Write a protein that binds this ligand. Structure first.
Ligand SMILES: *[C@@H]1O[C@H](CO)[C@@H](O)[C@H](O)[C@H]1NC(C)=O
Ligand SMILES: *[C@@H]1O[C@H](CO)[C@@H](O)[C@H](O)[C@H]1NC(C)=O
Ligand SMILES: *[C@@H]1O[C@H](CO)[C@@H](O)[C@H](O)[C@H]1NC(C)=O
Ligand SMILES: *[C@@H]1O[C@H](CO)[C@@H](O)[C@H](O)[C@H]1NC(C)=O
Ligand SMILES: *[C@@H]1O[C@H](CO)[C@@H](O)[C@H](O)[C@H]1NC(C)=O
Ligand SMILES: *[C@@H]1O[C@H](CO)[C@@H](O)[C@H](O)[C@H]1NC(C)=O
Ligand SMILES: *[C@@H]1O[C@H](CO)[C@@H](O)[C@H](O)[C@H]1NC(C)=O
Ligand SMILES: *[C@@H]1O[C@H](CO)[C@@H](O)[C@H](O)[C@H]1NC(C)=O
Ligand SMILES: *[C@@H]1O[C@H](CO)[C@@H](O)[C@H](O)[C@H]1NC(C)=O
Ligand SMILES: *[C@@H]1O[C@H](CO)[C@@H](O)[C@H](O)[C@H]1NC(C)=O
Lengths: 415, 451, 197, 49
């Protein structure tokens, strides 16, 4: 730590000690259903852009590796979660959407996106989590006469909120004259077909899009991944996994009164304090395992190679990561004597250590403030000196320090 | 706002005002000496037993080494401040078992041996006035393990890598040092600060103190009971003022409040996102792949590093301020308690006589005993007196006239005397002094020669 | 003895050492060497890595300058104290207790040192005390006699007057005593005679 | 002779001048004006700037 081969007399802080967890605890709610992802991805015709369906998925185990075997897609583009680690955590709500769009509006499905589909047909929220399965559909959504089974709307009077629909057809008017249901002057029907043809370019081919949405653990969980549970043990430094959150601490019993809609407990630093078991209705506290600082007390390397170790601020019945308990932790390697000398090496609240002969050893003691004196006071007694001494005393004071200069262009960049 | 009352002192070129009484006043000065020593672990604060976070934290070089070095230097400097203020006496002087110091009652600043911690009454009041924050000078992991009611502020402070180190000198040793200084000051005067302790009765020591400020020593020997009664009344008024108002100790409470508030802000800054998608590190580890979670952890690492650097910088500036205050307190201990000061408005307000230190949480309290003139009177004064073609000037004092007769009296007390060649000296004739008056000067040799 | 000036040297060495050593950190880039980044990449990606390196080195330089400012403030406070001690110990005599040395101050001698000053404080220390019995005043012919400067002491049989800081006993005379009042107001006044020359 | 109080005035003038001048910097963004960032980009890129 000192980057040297000879250390001097003193107390040095070297590192920190942390009690390591032993076991692993995995807790999940008990569900046996499988989420039917196979029945959604294949259909003769999907729903329209303006009439996209919604599937409520809950209370089932979802294995997401089977989605790669159901469609030959290029981009599995996701934002808030990586696609390879959905089997570990758990959620509370899974959505599903289905619509068929053009090939030039595939990138319009994005958080914080504007355009035609993203502004008037299908808008995603800015805080969107979960992602989208999109693949080409030129094989099944193409006809020589053209596909006219899907409709899209050109524009409306304002903007459209995320997760909003528009089914009804009304004749648009851009003037004071009334349309009266007839597409006359400044009156146009806003619905027209895509007209999918194989004679177009590569950017206008039909595409099949399936969108999934997730909801984070702000509630009791329903949907989970395939993961075996583990028996619950307490009063031991373990690695718990309560419904997809990892941590390390000592789980104990609690006296906190929880409301029936409550399952968590947070701290000021947004750290979990208590947790609800998904199996039984019992509240367990979370307290992190014991730690502290390690200070090494030594004389010089020219004197001895012995050391004494101070573990700061611990009751050291739990010390395995001469034992004497101080107020600043406890001291290992030095014995406590019932004497009092000057303070050589300061340890803590009134305790000092040194290197004395009573065979050389490192001892710990309570420091002495000074010699006890009791000057004789009386109301008719005085003491007057009869001689003197002349004393010369040295006092050292710093005055100036080193003057330095810097060049930013040669320090940061170097020509 | 009003600056004060309007006063118009009656200045004249032959008018003087001389006090005829006095009063003894005991004031109170409170000075901070030391503050809270703290040590912060970087890897537990920024990362918190995450190995990937530690691996990306190692790429920032040696920031945490110099933050640890700066906090260690501050923690050493605090103990140096307390040592250089309080540990100034060489022996632990003990007060005698008798309780007669010339009528002065010191029973409320001397320690009480009945209680375990040998602290005085005023020291107990000063310790009860400042509400302690229950810092890390007592270990609390056994209390933090047993969850009672809700999460404490101190437990949540310590769980994120923040540790408070206890001071080297306990309050018993500070109180023992203060008792040694009080016993030495009461018994031996200022002689214990310049060598061995030479005993002296307290009335004669107080007469030396009066002779220091320019008042002759017979004033104390004539007014000893009055001065003792005034000192006892002033001590009782100090007790009543400390028991009634708790706002006099605002500096030590300000030190405690700032030391708690900085750690509270440091704990609160862990819950911020700093542009990441989440503030909890384990959720980022358990939700995303390697590269994108490395980006999020990089954002969190930069934010927490900036917050820790800001905390260390304000701790350094506050430590410099506390060190300046501790240097002032050490100077006041060396110059007021261990001697008598001629510096104006140092060591209290008035003419300084004594001082008595008292220990306080994170500081020291001085009881400055001073001398204040009380009841003045108008007199007609002259610079010199012409007699037999010679100008007589006073040796020590001032010429005054009550209307018919001329006297000589001292400066700070009205004790008139007959103008005599013993208390006057002759310099020149009467044609050079402006304002010289005519009076006779008594000669002690003339009636003794004629008898 | 000279640990303060040695610490002044060591801090300014250590700050420059860590400021040089901070150039080896990558700060999130692919390398700490600027030429390797400039040769190994195109314009935009190298601009990203150089932005990371610039941010890290600017932060390290700002930390160095702030620490130097705080150390300069402490050094200026110590220099102000040393200038006050040069003005008050060497150039005069100090009545301030525990200023200009422990004892009763007599002289001082400056001595030059690297990055500082050394004062040699000559002081007076009393050595050999001796018990005496004392009184606040002397009652003689119904009058209270107080010393002009000094203290009444007795060896057991005779009363003398002597100065406070040395034992130079002298016979009690009207030249070294003054009278104010009578023997009915002072507590502890004793009976003796006063020599009239 | 009165250079110390003038230095006290000049330091506090110069620090506020530097704090005003620091608004013109880009700090690695594409523009020093916040409104042009908000109007010339989408949500994500302008959020980065
Ligand atoms: C889950 O476990 C609880 C308690 O062990 C039990 O009451 C409940 O019926 C179980 N549910 C299922 C679906 O297995
Ligand atoms: C599509 O899913 C259906 C079940 O809904 C299944 O019968 C069919 O074989 C699947 N086709 C392909 C090509 O995977
Ligand atoms: C903490 O240490 C003290 C020191 O004596 C001990 O008495 C107490 O039992 C300890 N607390 C535990 C082990 O919980
Ligand atoms: C002076 O001291 C003696 C011896 O301790 C004591 O008996 C006496 O009462 C004291 N004088 C006064 C006035 O208290
Ligand atoms: C002294 O004061 C009086 C009035 O206070 C004034 O008339 C007189 O001129 C003064 N003396 C001198 C020498 O100016
Ligand atoms: C000193 O004062 C306390 C209370 O203020 C009183 O109890 C005590 O008797 C006094 N001392 C003497 C010697 O009377
Ligand atoms: C002295 O004289 C002034 C004006 O002549 C007067 O105001 C004051 O009351 C007098 N007495 C005292 C004690 O100052
Ligand atoms: C004082 O007396 C002398 C002679 O006795 C006289 O010349 C002088 O004028 C007197 N002083 C005053 C102020 O009258
Ligand atoms: C003076 O008297 C005290 C009390 O009897 C005694 O302890 C001491 O030794 C004597 N001598 C000196 C030089 O103080
Ligand atoms: C001193 O002498 C006077 C008479 O000269 C006498 O009244 C008094 O009691 C004496 N005092 C002592 C303490 O002996």
């Amino acid at each position: 730590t000192l980057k040297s081969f000879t250390v001097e007399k003193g107390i040095y802080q070297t590192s920190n000690f942390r009690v390591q967890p032993t076991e692993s605890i995995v807790r999940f709610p008990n569900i046996t259903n499988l989420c039917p992802f196979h029945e959604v991805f294949n259909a003769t015709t999907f729903a329209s852009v303006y009439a996209w369906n919604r599937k409520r998925i809950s209370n089932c185990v979802a294995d997401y590796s089977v989605i790669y075997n159901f469609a030959p897609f290029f981009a599995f583009k996701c934002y808030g979660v990586s696609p390879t680690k959905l089997n570990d955590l758990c959620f509370t709500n899974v959505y599903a959407d289905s619509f068929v769009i053009r090939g030039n509006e595939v990138s319009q499905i994005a958080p914080g996106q504007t355009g035609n589909i993203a502004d008037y047909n299908y808008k995603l929220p800015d805080d969107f989590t979960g992602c989208v399965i999109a693949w080409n559909s030129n094989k099944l959504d193409s006809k020589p006469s053209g596909n006219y089974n899907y409709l899209y709307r050109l524009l409306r009077k304002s903007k459209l909120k995320p997760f909003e629909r528009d089914i009804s057809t009304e004749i648009y008017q851009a003037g004071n004259k009334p349309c009266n249901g007839v597409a006359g002057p400044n009156c146009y029907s806003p619905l027209q077909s895509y007209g999918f043809r194989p004679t177009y370019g590569v950017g206008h081919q039909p595409y099949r899009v399936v969108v999934l949405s997730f909801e984070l653990l702000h509630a009791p969980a329903t949907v989970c991944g395939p993961k075996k549970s583990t028996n619950l043990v307490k009063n031991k430094c373990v690695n718990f996994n309560f419904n997809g959150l990892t941590g390390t601490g000592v789980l104990t019993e609690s006296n906190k009164k929880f409301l029936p809609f409550q399952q968590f407990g947070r701290d000021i630093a947004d750290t979990t304090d208590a947790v609800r078991d998904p199996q039984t209705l019992e509240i367990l506290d979370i307290t992190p395992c014991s730690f502290g600082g390690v200070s090494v007390i030594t004389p010089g390397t020219n004197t001895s190679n012995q050391v004494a170790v101070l573990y700061q601020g611990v009751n050291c019945t739990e010390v395995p990561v001469n034992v004497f308990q101080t107020r600043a932790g406890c001291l290992i390697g030095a014995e406590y004597v019932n004497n009092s000398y000057e303070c050589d090496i300061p340890i803590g609240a009134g305790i000092c250590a040194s290197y004395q002969t009573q065979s050389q050893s490192i001892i710990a003691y309570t420091m002495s403030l000074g010699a006890e004196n009791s000057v004789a006071y009386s109301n008719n007694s005085i003491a007057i000196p009869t001689n003197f001494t002349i004393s010369v005393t040295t006092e050292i004071l710093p005055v100036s320090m080193t003057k330095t200069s810097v060049d930013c262009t040669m320090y940061i960049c170097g020509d | 706002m009003s600056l004060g009352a309007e006063n118009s002192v009656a200045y004249s070129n032959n008018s003087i005002a001389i006090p005829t009484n006095f009063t003894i006043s005991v004031t109170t000065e409170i000075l901070p000496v030391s503050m809270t020593k703290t040590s912060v672990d970087c890897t537990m604060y920024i990362c918190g037993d995450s190995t990937e976070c530690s691996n990306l934290l190692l790429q920032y070089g040696s920031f945490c080494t110099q933050l640890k070095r700066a906090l260690t230097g501050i923690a050493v400097e605090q103990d140096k401040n307390t040592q250089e203020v309080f540990a100034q006496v060489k022996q632990i002087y003990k007060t005698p078992p008798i309780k007669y110091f010339g009528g002065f009652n010191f029973s409320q600043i001397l320690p009480d041996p009945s209680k375990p911690s040998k602290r005085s009454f005023i020291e107990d009041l000063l310790f009860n006035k400042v509400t302690l924050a229950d810092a890390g000078f007592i270990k609390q992991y056994g209390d933090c393990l047993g969850d009672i009611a809700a999460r404490d502020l101190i437990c949540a402070q310590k769980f994120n890598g923040l540790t408070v180190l206890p001071p080297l000198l306990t309050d018993e040793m500070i109180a023992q040092y203060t008792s040694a200084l009080l016993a030495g000051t009461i018994t031996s005067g200022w002689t214990f600060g310049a060598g061995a302790a030479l005993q002296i009765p307290f009335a004669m020591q107080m007469a030396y103190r009066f002779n220091g400020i320019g008042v002759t020593q017979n004033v104390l020997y004539e007014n000893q009971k009055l001065i003792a009664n005034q000192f006892n009344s002033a001590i009782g008024k100090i007790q009543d003022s400390l028991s009634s108002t708790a706002s006099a100790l605002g500096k030590l409470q300000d030190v405690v409040n700032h030391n708690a508030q900085a750690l509270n802000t440091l704990v609160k800054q862990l819950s911020s996102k700093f542009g990441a998608i989440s503030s909890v590190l384990n959720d980022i580890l358990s939700r995303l792949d390697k590269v994108e979670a490395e980006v999020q952890i990089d954002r969190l690492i930069t934010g927490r590093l900036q917050s820790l650097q800001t905390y260390v910088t304000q701790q350094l500036i506050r430590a410099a301020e506390i060190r300046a205050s501790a240097n002032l307190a050490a100077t006041k201990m060396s110059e007021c308690v261990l001697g008598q000061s001629k510096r104006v408005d140092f060591c209290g307000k008035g003419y300084h006589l004594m001082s008595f230190p008292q220990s306080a949480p994170h500081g020291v309290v001085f009881l400055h005993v001073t001398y204040v003139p009380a009841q003045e009177k108008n007199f007609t004064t002259a610079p010199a007196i012409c007699h037999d073609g010679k100008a007589h000037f006073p040796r020590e004092g001032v010429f005054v006239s009550n209307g018919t007769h001329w006297f000589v009296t001292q400066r700070n007390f009205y004790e008139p005397q007959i103008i005599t060649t013993d208390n006057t000296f002759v310099s020149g004739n009467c044609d050079v002094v402006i304002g010289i008056v005519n009076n006779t000067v008594y000669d002690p040799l003339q009636p003794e020669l004629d008898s």
